[PDB]
Design a protein around this ligand. Structure first.
Ligand SMILES: [Zn+2]
Ligand SMILES: [Zn+2]
Ligand SMILES: [Zn+2]
Length: 227
């Protein structure tokens, strides 16, 4: 029981947090989740939709329902369900942020790079100078897992942490696409994400409904069998 704007579905997770869900037409439609965060008088979004058109529908839904200007956008890694709608963000005049590796990989992965590059310390935390005015967005690089450039976002003030494609649901039987995955360090990266946000009770991911942090330990267990 949630909203729908065009081909997208929006679900409220917190008083000022929404989950946008788009689908890719192909062995059937595939869902992909992202976040919409209201920070005071501005809106922060995480990940684009599969396409530019679907991404433009996110921004028009935001304008209709929240009526706040989108300050910045942050994508997690260079894939089409994260970075497919980069052209829509730039056309909407939104500052975009990504992992420096993601922006470097973007042309090779057939994506459009973000305007800014995020860098990370040895512990995985974003260099604050590269991420100005992120508000409640706590960005963390857990290490190579689903991709070598996958990053995660936590939301301060809430019980929500976004894992992206790094995290699968607790009832999952597989890890999805492992075509560009690092199987050796996948498990340690998952557990690092769990340690980065130790108080998160709601774990949002790309290809499932929001779950508890049992999804973290479960994903780690499936990743151990690739070591
Ligand atoms: Zn991916
Ligand atoms: Zn994905
Ligand atoms: Zn690839």
């Amino acid at each position: 029981g949630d909203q729908r704007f065009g081909d997208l579905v929006f679900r409220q997770l917190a008083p000022n947090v929404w989950q946008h869900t788009s689908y890719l037409d192909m062995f059937g439609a595939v869902a992909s989740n992202g976040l919409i965060v209201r920070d005071g008088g501005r809106v922060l979004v995480v990940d684009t939709a599969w396409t530019d058109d679907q991404t433009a529908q996110i921004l028009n839904w935001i304008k209709q329902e929240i009526n706040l200007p989108v300050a910045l956008a942050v994508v997690t890694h260079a894939h089409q369900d994260k970075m497919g709608g980069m052209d829509a963000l730039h056309a909407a005049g939104i500052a975009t942020y990504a992992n420096a590796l993601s922006n470097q990989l973007a042309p090779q992965e057939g994506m459009v790079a973000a305007q800014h590059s995020l860098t990370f310390a040895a512990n995985g935390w974003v260099e604050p100078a590269t991420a100005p005015n992120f508000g409640p967005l706590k960005v963390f690089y857990p290490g190579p897992g689903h991709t070598s450039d996958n990053i995660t976002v936590g939301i301060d003030g809430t019980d929500i942490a976004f894992g992206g494609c790094l995290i699968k649901d607790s009832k999952a039987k597989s890890l999805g696409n492992l075509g560009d995955a690092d199987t050796e360090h996948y498990a340690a990266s998952v557990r690092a994400f769990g340690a980065a946000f130790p108080k998160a009770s709601m774990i949002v991911m790309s290809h499932s409904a929001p779950d508890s942090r049992a999804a973290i330990t479960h994903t780690a267990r499936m990743a151990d069998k690739l070591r």
